[PDB]
Amino acid sequence: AIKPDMKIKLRMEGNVNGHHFVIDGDGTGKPFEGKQSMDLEVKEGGPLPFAFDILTTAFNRVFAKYPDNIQDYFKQSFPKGYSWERSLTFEDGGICNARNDITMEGDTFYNKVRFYGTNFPANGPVMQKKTLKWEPSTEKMYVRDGVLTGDVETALLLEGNAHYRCDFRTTYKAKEKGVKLPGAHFVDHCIEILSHDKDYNKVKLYEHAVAHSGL
């Protein structure tokens, strides 16, 4: 069902601290290598009055290198596809809820992303655009009450030698009942903005992910 080379199409609608936006994306990826890259364009609501870095994890764990000895819930979820819901809890009270419904049509993944942020202090690094990047992290994958859950404790690097900490919890659901849940495992991941324009209206985003058993 999943080819070595797949295309990505995206539309995100969202609101952060009452600021509405629409962002489209177009990319490609190698699902078996665990690599994806995409071109994002802000279509409505630009220039965004907050840190683009808070959105970038919302922009598909199908693009993760799974070893033979871990059940790949994401590749086995196609062709019908899967959804996730995610909460982002920042150390200064900032909260985001994001969701993605992922479908496949031929060689293309379609992504319907919704992203809601609130409670970002006006004086903080998100609304003042002081963020520099996400630090690489390990996602803890396990089952909670019959649902595949993933946790991440990570941080944004800020200007001036500081980190801004964020906890992610993500729930994953296949559309097909019957897709067996995997055992617990880890996903190492790195996400980078490769290029941007002045106000992050156009952004090239890269993500690489590798699943492992912690050895």
Numbering used by the authors: 3 to 61, 63 to 218
Q: What do the authors of the reporting publication say about this deposited model?
A:
Based on the EosFP sequence, we developed a new reversibly photoswitching rs-FP, ‘rsKiiro’ (described in detail in Supplementary Discussion 10). Reversible photoswitching occurs between a bright fluorescent cis anionic p-hydroxybenzylideneimidazolinone (HBDI) chromophore (the ‘on’ state) and the non-fluorescent trans neutral (the ‘off’ state), as is also the case for the rs-FP ‘Dronpa’. Compared to Dronpa, rsKiiro has substantially improved structural ordering in the ‘on’ ground state as well as the ‘off’ photoproduct, allowing high-resolution X-ray crystallography of the photoreactions. Illumination of the ‘on’ state with green light drives a cis–trans photoisomerization of the chromophore to produce a metastable non-fluorescent ‘off’ state with a neutral trans chromophore.
An ~100-fs pump interaction at 400 nm, close to resonance of the trans neutral chromophore (off state), creates an excited-state population with a lifetime of τ = 50 ps in both solution and crystals. A power density of 1,400 GW cm−2 (full-width at half-maximum, FWHM) was chosen for PP experiments to maximize the photoisomerization yield, based on optical measurements in crystals of anionic cis product absorption. The pump–probe observations up to 1-ps delay showed strong Fo–Fo difference electron-density features, up to 8.5σ, on the chromophore and on a hydrogen-bonded water and throughout the core of the protein. Coordinate refinement from extrapolated structure factors and occupancy refinement showed a small translational motion of the chromophore characterized by a 69-pm displacement of the phenolic oxygen. A 1.25-Å coordinate change of a nearby hydrogen-bonded water molecule modifies the O–O distance between the chromophore and water from 2.63 Å to 3.06 Å. A concomitant repositioning of the Gly155 backbone carbonyl changes its O–O distance to this water molecule from 2.77 Å to 2.84 Å. The larger distances in the femtosecond time-resolved structure suggest that the hydrogen bonding of the water molecule to both the chromophore and Gly155 is weakened. Other water molecules in the chromophore pocket and the side chains that primarily reside on the central helix undergo similar rearrangements. However, the PDP data show stronger differences and a modified temporal dependence compared to the PP measurement after the Stokes ‘dump’ pulse was introduced, and there are no discernible signals that are depleted by stimulated emission pumping. This observation forms our primary motivation for assigning the structural changes observed in the PP conditions to dominating ground-state motion, which is unconnected to the photoisomerization reaction coordinate. The excited-state coherence is not impulsively prepared; it is purely displacement-driven and insufficiently ordered, whereas the cis anionic chromophore product state is seen after full electronic and population decay and thermal proton transfer.
